[PDB]
Each structure stands twice: as structure tokens, then as C-alpha cells.
Amino acid sequence: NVFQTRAGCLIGAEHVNNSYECDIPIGAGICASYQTSQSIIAYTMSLGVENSVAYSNNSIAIPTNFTISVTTEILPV
């Protein structure tokens, strides 16, 4: 469990090549998360699910359905 990066030597964590959504940040693009017989793993942060929208001259997408979403924002005063 010895791994080095730009943030320095990190002991007690396993290196994973896959990229998921983590919790405990580290730095220099390397993060940390508790995942599966479970331990702490360190891996490069994931940038989100890749969605490639098709583009064409005559192609257009008009939504046929809608939804009503309610969000909560807490601003201190």
C-alpha cells in the first residue's frame, strides 16, 4: 500500500485505474474514496458521464414531455 503522486507519498491506500465519483479529496487530480472486504482506494477524479450529442444540419430534438422539479437553497442571512 505504497503510492506516490504530486501530492506526496500516500501510504495505506490502494491505487485504482478506474475513475468513479469519490468523497474525500486529496489533490493534483488524485482523490480518495471508501469502496469494496472494504478498504480505502485512491484514483484520478472522474469528470462525469460522457454524453455525445449528435449534430446534423436537418436534425433537431424537440421535447415531447416535461416535468416539474423543486429545488431547495439555503442562504445564510
Binding site: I60, P63, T67, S69, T71, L75, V77
Partner: protein, 238 residues
């Protein structure tokens, strides 16, 4: 009705199960709590002197040696209190900045309708519900978001008599056979008419224009009544 009532019910389930959503307000109380605790703990430090109790310094050391030792705590506790005031002035600029940002959301999102993008929250803003919170305010934002979509075939213009026709409101769509005019935010198929489009330019100045037949709502009404005019004057000549 089922979309709004179910969304409000999820608020009670989110606030009860997750207590960290209000952490924005808990950080204000915890910040002032750590500032008051540290400010008191500085009273027990000697500050390079013999003792931290000024009553013991006066009751033991001589008057000439006491004024030097007592001055060490007075100077130290003064700098420790200036540090507290300095932190409070800095934290005041943070809480007043969030208050000015909240005062703007009360006017634009709640009182009126704000067309700003992602100011009232993600999606197209509709109506905002203010709520009371300790040392703060909670905002409930009702927004309009699309759900499902379908790929359509569009055209920049419709060519009929040789003059280009452009949509007044909405965009052109097609299922592969008929060309319809629908809104961008919602799909409402409508027959292309002279009332929904306007004539500008010609067909040669538009790149990608397609040929179609623009239905004139005045055409069949006048023609059917024109046949009443032809048959009437037919009796005039008979």
C-alpha cells in the same frame, strides 16, 4: 398536480433523512462558537509571565515587579481580543455578502419573475417559495425542466410560391412526411399556415430551403364563397 404535490413531499423526506443539507447555517453557528471558545481560553495563558492570575501576581510580587508582570497579560489579552475583533469584521463581510445575495433572490425569484439563467436554480424558473430558517432563509424554487425528447427533421425555410416563409413563433419539424410548426419548449404539432409564418426574401437566398405547400386558411373560405358568387351571377345570366 401529481408533479408538484409529489415534489413538495420529497422535501420533508430530504430534510428529515439528510441533516447535512442545512450545514450552511450550522457553519455560521460553529464558526461563532469556536471564536467565543478560543477567546475565553486565552485568559488562562500566562503570556510569558509568571502566572495567568492577576490576583496572585499582586498578592506575591513587589509593586515595582508587579506592574511589569501585570502589563504582560494586559498587552497579551489586548492582542488576543483584537484578533477576535479582526476575525469578526472578516466574517461580517461574508455574512453580509450572503445577505445581499439572498435579498436579491427574494425580489427576483419570489416577488417577481426572474429570467436570469440559473439564478433561481437549475431550469426555467416559475415560482419561488421563501421559508424561515434560524439565522438564515430557505428557498423553495419551482422550475420547468423537459423530460423526454424525440429526434425530428427540420428545415430553415419553406418554399411555396417562390418566396421564403419563416416561422413567426417556434421551429419547423417533420416526421418524414408532413412539416409541422412546434414550439421549442414543448411539442405541439400545427399545420403550416400563412398566419403562423411571414414572407421575407425569396427561396434563392436561404441555404437549405425545402419545397412544400403552405396552407392558406383564407383560400378555401373565399373559394367556397366565390362559388356562391359564380353561381349567383350564373342566374343573372340565365
Amino acid at each position: 398536480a401529481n408533479q408538484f404535490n409529489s415534489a413538495i413531499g420529497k422535501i420533508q423526506d430530504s430534510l428529515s433523512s439528510t441533516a447535512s443539507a442545512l450545514g450552511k447555517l450550522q457553519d455560521v453557528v460553529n464558526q461563532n462558537a469556536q471564536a467565543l471558545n478560543t477567546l475565553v481560553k486565552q485568559l488562562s495563558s500566562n503570556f510569558g509571565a509568571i502566572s495567568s492570575v492577576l490576583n496572585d501576581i499582586l498578592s506575591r510580587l513587589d509593586p515595582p515587579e508587579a506592574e511589569v508582570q501585570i502589563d504582560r497579560l494586559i498587552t497579551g489579552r489586548l492582542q488576543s481580543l483584537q484578533t477576535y475583533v479582526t476575525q469578526q469584521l472578516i466574517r461580517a463581510a461574508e455574512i453580509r455578502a450572503s445577505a445581499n445575495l439572498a435579498a436579491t433572490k427574494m425580489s427576483e425569484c419570489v416577488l417577481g419573475q426572474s429570467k436570469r439563467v440559473d439564478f433561481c436554480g437549475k431550469g426555467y424558473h416559475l415560482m419561488s417559495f421563501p421559508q424561515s430558517a434560524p439565522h438564515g432563509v430557505v428557498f423553495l424554487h419551482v422550475t420547468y425542466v423537459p423530460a423526454q425528447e424525440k429526434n425530428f427533421t427540420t428545415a430553415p425555410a419553406i418554399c411555396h410560391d417562390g418566396k421564403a416563409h419563416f416561422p413567426r413563433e417556434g421551429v419547423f419539424v417533420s416526421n418524414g412526411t408532413h412539416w409541422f410548426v412546434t414550439q421549442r419548449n414543448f411539442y405541439e404539432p400545427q399545420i403550416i399556415t400563412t398566419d403562423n409564418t411571414f414572407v421575407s426574401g425569396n427561396c434563392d437566398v436561404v441555404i437549405g430551403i425545402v419545397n412544400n405547400t403552405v396552407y392558406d386558411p383564407l383560400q378555401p373560405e373565399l373559394d367556397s364563397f366565390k362559388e356562391e358568387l359564380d353561381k349567383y351571377f350564373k342566374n343573372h345570366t340565365s
